[PDB]
Amino acid sequence: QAQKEAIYRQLDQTTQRFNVGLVAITDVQNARAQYDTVLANEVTARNNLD
Amino acid sequence: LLGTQYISKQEYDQALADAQQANAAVTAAKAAVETARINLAYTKVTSPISGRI
Amino acid sequence: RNFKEGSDIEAGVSLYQIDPATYQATYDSAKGDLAKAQAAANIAQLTVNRYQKLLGTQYISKQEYDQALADAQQANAAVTAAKAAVETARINLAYTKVTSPISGRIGKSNVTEGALVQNGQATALATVQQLDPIYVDVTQSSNDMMRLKQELANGTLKQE
């Protein structure tokens, strides 16, 4: 969850770079995939918790 | 490559900076030829009017 | 030549045509480099406009913004170099010639069309003159304008 405060924050600015124009659409759809891997690790963290 | 938005919009304009400034450099060199072409209208000394010499 | 000889010509009335061929080139080298400075500062103006929207929020990391706010303020200064370098080479282009900024009656044309003229040449092209307030160089003797100034002690008297 400190990675999801980080890599979503990475997504929440690579998206806000594309809304300006600094990155290509790959670096959004990459950074979402690097964000959604954080979910598929953090959900397993919440699953390996239980 | 930005019709399908596949490079940055920034790297385009930065290349469009380089496009427009280098075409602004050719104009700054086509004039520099036009400086030195006009020396070769200043050699071969053109009679600036007509009439008798 | 573009006036009528002996007429009356106002100030700034460009009626000599020095050959622009060299100076139209130096105007185009300079107005080229204005666009070489503008279009290099145009995108330097976008890269602040594209980074101003990320200030306080996340990526732009104020120094990497202020490295672009260098490059906008620095390359807009390069425009101010080149826009004045145009304004230098504009006042060597539309700087041909007539008249010198007096307004009055033009005399001859000591030059004629085709004769090469030089930068601050020895002779003159034409002489614009203004006539209605006119001077007369009265030329007093020296011993008088001691004596007539020493007649301020004995006399004079000049008034009012």
Q: What angle do CA C19, C25, C30 make, to 5 degrees?
A: 130
Residues for chain A: how many in total? 50
Question: Beta strands C8-9 and C128-129: pairing type?
Answer: unpaired
Q: Tell me which chain B residue has its CA closest to the CA of residue A20.
A: B9
Rounded to a whole number of angstroms, the distance from the CA of A42 to the nearest CA of chain C is 23
Q: By what method was this entry solved?
A: cryo-EM
* CB proximity under 8 Å: B 1-53 to A: 5-10, 13
Query: With the CA atoms of C143, C148, C150 and C155 taken in that order, what torsion angle do they form, in degrees rounded to the nearest 10?
Result: 160
Phi–psi pair at C27, nearest 5 degrees = -70, -35
Give the CB-side neighbour count of residue C144, counting CA atoms within 13 A: 3
Task: Give the strand order in the sheet containing C104-106.
Answer: C8-9, C104-106, C128-129
Q: Do residue A13 and residue C53 have CB atoms under 8 angstroms apart?
A: no
Q: Tell me if residue B7 falls in helix, strand or coil.
A: coil
Nearest Cα residue to C64 out of C73, C55, C77, C74: C55
Decide if C9 contacts C103 (C-beta within 8 A): yes
Least Cα distance to C112 among C123, C103, C120 occurs for: C123
Q: What is the DSSP letter of C55?
A: S
Q: In which residue are the tokens 């303020």 written?
A: C73
Contact assessment for residue C15 and residue C2, using Cβ atoms and an 8 Å cutoff: yes
Q: Which of the residues B13, B20, B21, B52 would you substitute to probe the C interface, choosing the one with the greatest number of C C-beta atoms within 10 Å?
A: B21
d(CA C33, CA B24): 6
How many CA atoms lie within 13 Å of B31's alpha carbon, on the beta-carbon side?
20
Which residues, at least 6 apart from C93, have a Cβ–Cβ distance to it below 8 Å?
A: C20, C23, C24, C26, C27
Among chain C residues, the shortest Cα distance to A12 is held by: C58
Does residue B24 sit at the C interface (CB-CB below 8 Å)?
yes
Question: Which residue among B20, B34, B47 places its CB closest to the CB of C39?
Answer: B20
Question: Which tokens sit at C33?
Answer: 């480099």
Q: What are the chain C neighbours of B26 within 8 Å (beta carbons)?
A: 32
Q: Checking DSSP bridges between strand C128-129 and strand C104-106, what pairing results, if any?
A: antiparallel
The answer for A12, left when phi > 0, alpha when psi is -120 to 50, beta otherwise, is: alpha
Q: Which residues contact A13 (CB under 8 A, 6 or more apart)?
A: C54, C57, C58, C59
Rg (CA), chain C: 29
Q: Are B10 and A21 in contact (CB under 8 A)?
A: yes
Distance CA A1, CA A12 (A): 15
**Dist CA B50 CA C115 (whole Å):** 12
A-chain CB neighbours of B5 within 8 Å are 24-25
What do you get for the CA distance between the two ends of chain C, in Å? 50
Q: Do the beta carbons of residue C106 and residue C9 sit within 8 Å? A: yes
- Tracing tokens 């806000």 back to the chain, one arrives at A16
The helix (H) or strand (E) run that includes residue C105 is strand C104-106
CB contact under 8 A, A22 and C58: no
Q: For residue B46, is it left (φ>0), alpha (ψ between -120 and 50) or beta?
A: beta
Resolution of this entry, Å: 6.5
Nearest by CB to residue B34, choosing from C25, C30, C35, is C25
Please, what's the b/e burial string for B30-48 (b: 16 or more CB within 10 A of its CB; e: otherwise)? ebbebbeebeeeeeeeeee
Structural contact between residues B11 and A26, judged by C-beta atoms closer than 8 angstroms? no
Helices (H), chain C: 21-52, 63-90, 144-147
